[PDB]
RNA sequence: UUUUU
RNA sequence: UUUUU
RNA sequence: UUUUU
RNA sequence: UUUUU
RNA sequence: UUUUU
């Protein structure tokens, strides 16, 4: 990224802090297009997508698995002020306003964590999947519906 | 903090090394799509019919 | 080309930047005639074709395979503004407005790229071909329907 | 026909919204492609007629 | 090529594990995949090991 | 803790 | 391990 | 993400 | 055994 | 490898 956006600065600190949020409120997959944006007061200075994705060797979740507790405390605060809930449950119909803590697309389970919420995490994980298959292969390139003739036309 | 779409470190062809060919002043070029095609003909032809 | 159009300039930078576009919006084959053109404001200063084709040793795709990511970001921008889609799918009936990214006539697959769009790329590649054959030879030149007589007429 | 769910909203009506959403759909498929343009049922002959 | 009695594969069958470790390293750095699957549509980034 | 029309 | 838009 | 006449 | 551009 | 108007 440092080669891409040409900062020569640790402002990328602030940038990636931005990327946390659009990463949160919406899905996580290579199958993304459009843009994203954050704000500065009332402004909406936009930003692109792709090279933050085409330039990691494992996937996007496998890199963002770090940024766990920061957004955790984030939602703790701004939920303590007001009844925020994220997107990912509102499509999947959570019930408890308390259990916003783990309505993420991504997380890493650890041995410091409660019992109850695990159930919703895993059930709502797998059941939120369906239908899409491993379905390995697409189709091959060598597509000659016929063989070369290897002859000659003459009068 | 703001920036632009196009870049310079991108993988790009090179006549010789220092040269970058797709000169990055092309920010402003988006005419009508169909206007550029071959499936529509040209303005000159459109004139000469109208005159013939 | 530098011998042909006699610039003594790197304006050919801008020219070839033009050639990107007519190269994009329409097919790529030796079987081309007519002209092409770009604009300057509202003007339509035209330009010819052939010597950009008769003067490369492998084919035209095999040279334009470079200019990949430039037009990629191009369409990213001008699609982000407005619902552009190119030609090549509109003849082949794409469905998703998002997947304009790879409705080209040409591209080089790489190991930084998604899974999904590959399917449409290859399927719509080969199925967009049909009927045209390898069909090597045309016909030969030595066409004497008869043999010389090698005689004489006399009274 | 349309709405955006938010975190200020009740529990009950969500059920009817989503059930009546998806069940009001049926049958219509993703069904990507139509058909292609290059439709030559034959190949050019590339010959000549003479007497 | 014109100077081996059996074919080219039948000689290059030696050089197996060297390029194997090669791709192990330079894949461990970065998401490389070779050509031969990208024409044939592999799926797993892990299974570059045998897209020869 | 929620769930009381 | 992947697959959660 | 799309697909609700 | 050959035949994988 | 070629062959996508």
Residue numbers in the entry:
A (entry chain K), C (entry chain B): 118 to 272
B (entry chain A): 66 to 117
D (entry chain J): 222 to 272
E (entry chain C): 170 to 221
Show passages lifted from the paper.
In this work we explore the structure of TuMV virions and VLPs to unveil the differences in their architecture and understand the contribution of protein-RNA interactions in the assembly of the virions. Using cryoEM and following single particle-based helical image processing, we have explored the structure of the potyvirus TuMV and its VLPs. TuMV virions were isolated from infected plants of Indian mustard, and VLPs of TuMV CP were produced by its transient expression in Nicotiana benthamiana plants.
The cryoEM 3D map for TuMV virions shows a left-handed helical arrangement identical to that of earlier characterized flexible filamentous plant viruses. The atomic coordinates for TuMV CP show a central alpha-helical core and two long arms. The cryoEM map does not show density (we could not model them) for the first 65 amino acids at the N-terminal end, a flexible region exposed to the solvent. The last 16 residues at the C-terminus cannot be traced. The N-terminal arm of each TuMV CP interacts with other two subunits. There is a side-by-side interaction between the N-terminal arm and a groove in the adjacent subunit mediated by hydrophobic interactions. After a 90° turn, the N-terminal arm reaches another subunit in the next turn of the helix where the interaction is favored by complementary electrostatic potentials. The dual role for the N-terminal arm that supports side and axial polymerization and the nature of the local interactions (hydrophobic and electrostatic) were also observed for WMV4 and PVY5 and seem to describe a signature for potyviruses. The density for the ssRNA is clear (red density in Fig. 2d) and each TuMV CP subunit spans five nucleotides of the viral genome. Residue N103 from one CP subunit (Ni), and the pair R204 and R209 from the adjacent CP (Ni-1) interact with the phosphate backbone of the ssRNA.
